[PDB]
Amino acid sequence: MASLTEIEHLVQSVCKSYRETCQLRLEDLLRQRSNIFSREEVTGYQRKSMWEMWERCAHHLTEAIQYVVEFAKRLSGFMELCQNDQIVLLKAGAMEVVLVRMCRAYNADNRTVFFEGKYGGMELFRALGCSELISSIFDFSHSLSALHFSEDEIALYTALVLINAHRPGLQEKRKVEQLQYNLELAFHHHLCKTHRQSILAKLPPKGKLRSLCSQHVERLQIFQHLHPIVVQAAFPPLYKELFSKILHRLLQE
Ligand SMILES: C[C@@](O)(CS(C)(=O)=O)C(=O)N[C@@H]1CC[C@@]2(S(=O)(=O)c3ccc(F)cc3)c3ccc(C(F)(C(F)(F)F)C(F)(F)F)nc3CC[C@@H]12
């Protein structure tokens, strides 16, 4: 059950939802590639206190996750699913969706990312005190950039990152399995029709996204043990909910 014309309709529906929930447009990000942070500006970021850079980054991650919630709410089938399943899917997939979406603002020619109005390399995030996590994020982006994704490909791949029937805690597993299968078909059909099936082999292993997320959660536990009042007083509520309700409020609109 689901004919070719229904699969093609799902492709365009997913692409539209992705376009409408993008933080910034792709052309805006490309037109800013020459706006790079100077050595002085880079030094200023490195000289910020660890707690200040953590709070700035947790706020940026929170803002980006808010767009993933909107993308999920526009995805066919997501709002039909029970509240427990919606939250399980968003808690496990939101960081992963943001990590994949970040490749649009990543310039492989100089290994820089769009951050606070300009492009900057890994060295910009030195005050965080997590070089191994920063390296992993930059390597993941570099390896995604080698695939040269079109916007339609990121829309379909990120819908699949989110709609995963294997996430622990799902009460209606089969209902998510059908949704995932329809999106798998829509993604593969789009790759077939556009002569892009060669990327399937070169996509990152599902364990790579899982490793980046566990590194993020473990480094946050290190930060919170040393600065518990900072996390309580200045970290965004949605960020503590997901990584340390708000999600219920966002899902009811
Ligand atoms: C492109 C855009 O910048 C948005 S835009 C288009 O410019 O508006 C974006 O999508 N950003 C994403 C949302 C915020 C950001 S970031 O810019 O602050 C950034 C980027 C690369 C890094 F190596 C570290 C941080 C971020 C913030 C905090 C963390 C941490 F897990 C970290 F990895 F840093 F540890 C943590 F723990 F701090 F939360 N990780 C990330 C990785 C994803 C990006």
From Swiss-Prot:
Changing residue 115 to Q: Completely abolishes transcriptional activity. The keyword Nucleus applies. Isoform 1 is widely expressed in many tissues, including liver and adipose, and highly expressed in skeletal muscle. Isoform 2 is primarily expressed in immature thymocytes. GO terms for molecular function: DNA-binding transcription factor activity; DNA-binding transcription factor activity, RNA polymerase II-specific; DNA-binding transcription repressor activity, RNA polymerase II-specific; ligand-modulated transcription factor activity; nuclear receptor activity; oxysterol binding; RNA polymerase II cis-regulatory region sequence-specific DNA binding; sequence-specific double-stranded DNA binding. Keywords: Activator, Biological rhythms, Developmental protein, Disease variant, DNA-binding, Metal-binding, Nucleus, Receptor, Transcription, Transcription regulation, Zinc, Zinc-finger. Residues 6-244 form the NR LBD domain. Belongs to the nuclear hormone receptor family. NR1 subfamily. This is Nuclear receptor ROR-gamma. It comes from Homo sapiens (Human). The chain holds residues 265 to 507 of 518 of the full protein.
